[PDB]
Amino acid sequence: GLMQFTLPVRLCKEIELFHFDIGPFENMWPGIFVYMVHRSCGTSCFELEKLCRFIMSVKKNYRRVPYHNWKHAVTVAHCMYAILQNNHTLFTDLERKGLLIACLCHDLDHRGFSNSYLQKFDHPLAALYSTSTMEQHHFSQTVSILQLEGHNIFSTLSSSEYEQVLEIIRKAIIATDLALYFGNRKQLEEMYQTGSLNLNNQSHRDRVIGLMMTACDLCSVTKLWPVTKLTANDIYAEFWAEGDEMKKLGIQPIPMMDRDKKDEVPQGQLGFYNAVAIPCYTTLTQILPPTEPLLKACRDNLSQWEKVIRGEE
C-alpha cells in the first residue's frame, strides 16, 4: 500500500509535459507506466502484484516491429496520462483506470501491417473481423490477457463496473482505427459549433474519448522535432515493408508505402498533418482547452516539414 514509484528528477518533471519522450531504456518503461497509473488513478486502483504481471504479459504480446511495438504502447499511454492530468475533474474513476490500460493495449500483437494489407492478403483475421480488423484483434488480445490467472487487475470492481470498464476499453481501442477518426471528428466539430456537445450524454463522451485515443495514437507528431523526425523513420520502415508485401501480391502500393518514392515523403507528411493531425488536435483543443500544447507542438512540426521541402533541412 505504501510503495510509491519515484522517477529521477528530470523524468519526474518532464513526464508531466505532453512532449515527454520515454527514453531508450526499455527496463524503465513498466515503472514509468505504474508511476502514471498511481498519479492518474491512485495507488489503490490496482493490486501492484497483478498490475506488474499484466504489464509484463502485455509487453510479451507486442512484437519486435519498427514502430507498432511496446515503446509505442507506453508512448500512447503517456500522452493519455498528460491529457487526463491536465483535465483532472472531467473524467470518472473508471475512465482514468480504463483509458491508460486501453492505450497500453491498443496495438497488442500488431504485425506492422494495415487493415488494407490483411484484407488483400486474405488473412484469417480479415474473415473474423470485416472492419477495424487489427483493432478487434487488439481488444480480443486484451481480454485474453485479463483472463490469465493472476492478471485480472479489475477483480475488485462490481460486475457492472467491470462491464463498464471493458466497454470503455473496447470503444477506446476500436477508435484507434484511423478510418473511423474522420467521421468522429466531423460529428464532434458539428456538435461543438452548433453548441449541442454535452459531456453528460454517454454517446458524446464516447466520441470525445475516441478523439483523445486518435490524439494519443498520433502523438509522435507532437514531440520535439528531433523525436518526431526519428520516429517518422520507424513509421516509414513499416510502410515500406507493407509496400514490398503489396508488390509480392502483384499490387502497386500507394506512393506513401513505396520505398522507391522516398522523395515524396515530406509532401506526404504535409498532407497527413493538414488532413489528419492538425484537424485532430484543433477539435481536441476546442473540446479540452488544456490540450493546446499538442496543437502548438503539431503546428511546430508541420513548419519543420515545410522547411525539409524548401531544402532548408
Ligand X SMILES: c1nc(N2CCCC2)c2cc[nH]c2n1
- Evaluate whether 264 touches 255 at the Cβ level (below 8 Å): yes
Contact present, 213 and 176 (Cβ < 8 Å):
yes
Q: Choose the stretch contacting ligand X; rule: CB under 6 A; options: 4-12, 191-199, 213-221, 305-313.
A: 213-221
Task: State which amino acid sits at residue 132.
Answer: S
The minimum distance between CB 110 and Zn ion, in angstroms, equals 7
Instruction: Check if the beta carbon of residue 106 is closer than 8 Å to that of residue 176.
Output: yes
Nearest distance from residue 216's CB to Zn ion, in Å? Answer: 8
234 is in an annotated binding site: no
Shortest distance, position 107 Cβ to Mg ion, whole Å: 4
| The one among 218, 219, 241, 298 contacting ligand X by CB under 6 A | 218
Task: Indicate whether 238 belongs to the interface with Mg ion (CB under 5 A).
Answer: no
Binding residues (CB under 5 A) for Zn ion: these are 107, 217
Task: Give Cα separations from 287 to 41, 80, 89, 199 (angstroms).
Answer: 22, 15, 14, 10
Could you please report the per-residue DSSP string of 254-265? PGGG-GGGGGGH
Given Zn ion, Mg ion, ligand X, none, residue 178, with its beta carbon under 5 to 8 Å by kind, binds ligand X
Nearer to ligand X, 7 or 256 (CB): 256
Residue from the set 90, 178, 227, 302 that interacts with ligand X by CB under 6 A: 178
- Looking at residues 98 to 157 of the shown chain, list those that interact with Mg ion (rule: CB under 5 A): 107
The residue whose Cβ lies closest to Zn ion is 107
Which one of the spans 23-31, 121-129, 200-208, 214-222 is the region binding ligand X (CB under 6 A)? Answer: 214-222
Among 132, 133, 142, 176, binds Mg ion (CB under 5 A): 176
Nearest to ligand X of 39, 299 (CB atom): 299
Cell digits for 176?
Answer: 484507434
Packing angle, helices 29-40 and 48-60, rounded to 10: 130
Please report whether residue 220 would count as binding ligand X according to CB under 6 A: yes
Contacts with Mg ion: how many residues (CB under 5 A)? Answer: 2
- d(CA 217, CA 205) in angstroms, rounded, equals 18
Residue 160 burial (CB < 10 Å; 0-12/13-18/19+)? Answer: exposed
List 19, 68, 78, 137, catalytic entry: 68
Q: Which three cell numbers, joined as nine digits, stand for 146?
A: 485479463
Site for ligand X in 23-62 (CB under 6 A): none
Amino acid identity for residue 185 in this structure: R
- Whether 68 sits among the annotated catalytic residues: the reply is yes
Q: How far is CA 59 from the centre of its chain?
A: 15
Query: With binding defined as CB under 6 A, does residue 235 bind ligand X?
Result: yes
176 vs 291 by CB, closer to Mg ion: 176
Q: What distance in Å separates the CA atoms of residue 243 and residue 252, rounded to the nearest whole number?
A: 8
Least separation in angstroms between CB 278 and ligand X: 13
Cα–Cα distance, 41 to 4 (Å, whole number): 13
Instruction: Write the CA distances from 101 to 46, 84, 231, 290, 296, integer angstroms.
Output: 11, 13, 23, 22, 27
Burial of 24 per CB tally in 10 Å (0-12, 13-18, 19+): exposed
Binding residues: 68, 72, 106-107, 217, 269
Binding residues for a divalent metal cation: 72, 106-107, 217
Give contact residues for Mg ion (rule: CB under 5 A).
Answer: 107, 176
Active-site residue set: 68
Binding residues for 3',5'-cyclic GMP: 68, 269
Give contact residues for ligand X (rule: CB under 6 A).
Answer: 178, 218, 220-221, 232, 235, 269, 272
